[PDB]
């Protein structure tokens with residue numbers, strides 16, 4: 077470490093003196109650091125935050141600057157672990173609070189699925205909903221995100237259970253890369269299928285060989301990879317959605333009191349389905365609070381007789397159970413039988429299956445599995461997997477969303493086109509039947525206007541697609557009996573059906589695509605030019621160099637707020653400081669005005 | 683290099699006529715716009731190729747007999763016999779045709795696949811001609827604007 081050159085000679089000899097004396101001219105740096113650094117870090121973190129607080133609160137203090145320059149090392153070391161939050165409601169002034177952030181929490185935040193959830197949440201909150209419920213949406217996002225990062229950190233019978241759990245965790249971890257592998261193998265199998273020729277038999281031996289065996293291998297490999305993808309999704313993202321649904325129904329029971337006072341409406345099929353889980357054994361399987369049943373019963377039983385409530389929630393009397401446990405805790409343990417019969421709650425499993433099947437992404441994966449099975453039945457069905465690139469890429473997803481964004485108006489315009497084509501059809505059928513002859517030879521004429529159904533189907537199929545209209549696909553009206561009438565007919569058809577209605581139909585989708593692109597660009601611009609927490613203008617921080625960068629990095633940071641919530645949850649309630657306890661009580665009462673939505677620390681003082 | 687190749691064959695001097703694009707600002711703007719949205723343009727072209735491939739496999743499986751280009755009663759020129767030929771034909775002809783793929787194939791008078799073939803042609807015209815090609819054109823026009 078003299079070659080390392082981290083200290084001066086005095087510090088080197090001090091470290092030698094404090095070094096473990098092996099009495100054999102040796103030292104064990106592992107045990108040395110384990111003994112010294114950890115208490116040093118845990119105790120000096122408070123010193124570092126004290127110096128940081130003094131520096132931020134006390135400007136233009138030369139002595140304090142000397143202390144900071146002497147303590148540069150500790151501040152630099154603890155800079156990643158130091159988190160800063162601004163709170164408005166504290167004494168009606170903006171106040172800065174400092175806390176500790178774990179490197180494990182930072183890594184879990186950097187996990188890819190957490191980042192994907194973050195970007196989806198930001199898009200949802202910025203594009204729609206405004207800022208009226210922005211704080212509530214942010215708090216819900218924080219709860220779901222900390223649950224997601226806890227799940228990620230989590231990611232002979234005992235041996236096999238451990239092995240299968242490890243396999244499931246591996247699939248959950250490698251869900252995305254295996255998804256890309258599935259896309260690549262789908263592209264390869266489609267490339268192989270491209271060399272197909274009819275002989276009724278669909279012979280693929282266009283080349284010398286080595287195509288059918290590898291095609292079969294790629295098909296079975298694709299099916300296996302798709303099954304593994306669905307397993308990984310089930311063990312990765314299903315817990316998050318079921319946790320969200322359980323939280324929603326539990327909060328409805330607590331605050332709204334849905335299944336207690338007034339039953340959900342019949343149109344609320346989601347509420348009707350959720351009625352099934354409010355009475356099973358493990359209702360809050362993923363929700364952190366397992367006492368929601370006791371809370372709702374203590375809330376409403378004294379008014380509703382406690383008996384209907386006890387029956388509808390199960391478990392009988394929560395108050396009686398709590399009293400019995402408090403008087404004497406159950407001094408026994410239930411042995412885990414190997415061949416235990418129906419240990420799981422069948423009703424809860426049915427509810428979970430219902431919600432995961434109503435989920436959209438799981439439906440897409442089920443469709444992928446079905447397409448793979450149909451591809452095994454007939455190899456040609458693998459072409460449907462080529463549309464996964466639309467999900468993969470954002471622009472293609474934007475086009476697929478735009479094709480349905482204006483669905484109602486598009487359907488109405490198509491209906492109007494059908495109606496006007498029908499009117500032209502009946503006019504032609506009544507007056508211009510003889511002109512619709514497609515027989516090029518003097519053989520039996522092919523009148524398309526003899527029958528109304530045929531005439532209308534012909535009009536819709538041909539006139540709309542034709543650039544010139546209907547007049548370009550029928551005999552010219554040389555006869556003077558209907559010359560001008562037929563010409564006006566054709567011109568009106570061309571004007572109203574070709575260059576107006578079809579133009580509007582095209583413009584609806586093109587404008588939907590443009591509007592979606594503009595919305596995404598506007599979300600990005602807002603994120604770049606305003607602060608999520610407070611909303612102060614970008615220029616005010618730009619008054620100083622990189623002022624907005626600093627404000628969004630350390631002053632108001634979404635990760636910092638999430639880590640502060642995690643810190644409050646992890647800390648013991650008795651150990652909470654004044655500001656921490658106030659914020660915790662506010663979060664419990666669901667008020668959410670501690671966020672400095674109005675002002676900032678700088679506008680408060682400097 | 684173009685001048686040297688022009689000495690090798692005088693006809694290579696035609697490539698120098700593109701220097702006006704560098705010379706004038708508006709022409710340079712068009713040449714920059716043709717690549718400003720390059721990533722999205724490539725993605726849209728890929729989506730067009732994918733959808734044309736899907737229509738190709740559908741036609742190959744069900745509507746092979748309609749793709750006859752033999753005007754005389756001589757040996758039929760089936761363009762749908764081979765998948766590679768059918769897909770290349772679709773990409774080359776259906777995209778360029780204003781009416782879609784139904785205007786370059788035999789009309790489905792037979793009742794066995796009348797409605798199926800008509801829906802096929804209408805969907806091809808709607809999704810490939812008046813949507814995807816429109817988006818591809820609009821990308822470059824909007825980049826120029």
Ligand SMILES: Nc1ncnc2c1ncn2[C@@H]1O[C@H](COP(=O)(O)OP(=O)(O)OP(=O)(O)O)[C@@H](O)[C@H]1O
Nearest residue numbers: 191195603604605606607608609628632633634635
């Ligand atoms: N907590 C915040 N408050 C206010 N503005 C913020 C906050 N976090 C980020 N921003 C702003 O959002 C801009 C876009 O960066 P953002 O932090 O949203 O994405 P990123 O983390 O860099 O990207 P990615 O998720 O792709 O890795 C930043 O330049 C910053 O101005």
Ligand SMILES: Cn1c(=O)c2c(ncn2C)n(C)c1=O
Nearest residue numbers: 218219220222223364365645
């Ligand atoms: C009170 N509380 C929470 O509020 C919480 C939590 N996990 C997430 N959240 C939001 N846990 C475990 C918890 O005890």
Ligand SMILES: [Ca+2]
Nearest residue numbers: 649650651652
């Ligand atoms: Ca205390």
Ligand SMILES: [Zn+2]
Nearest residue numbers: 607609610632
């Ligand atoms: Zn801010």
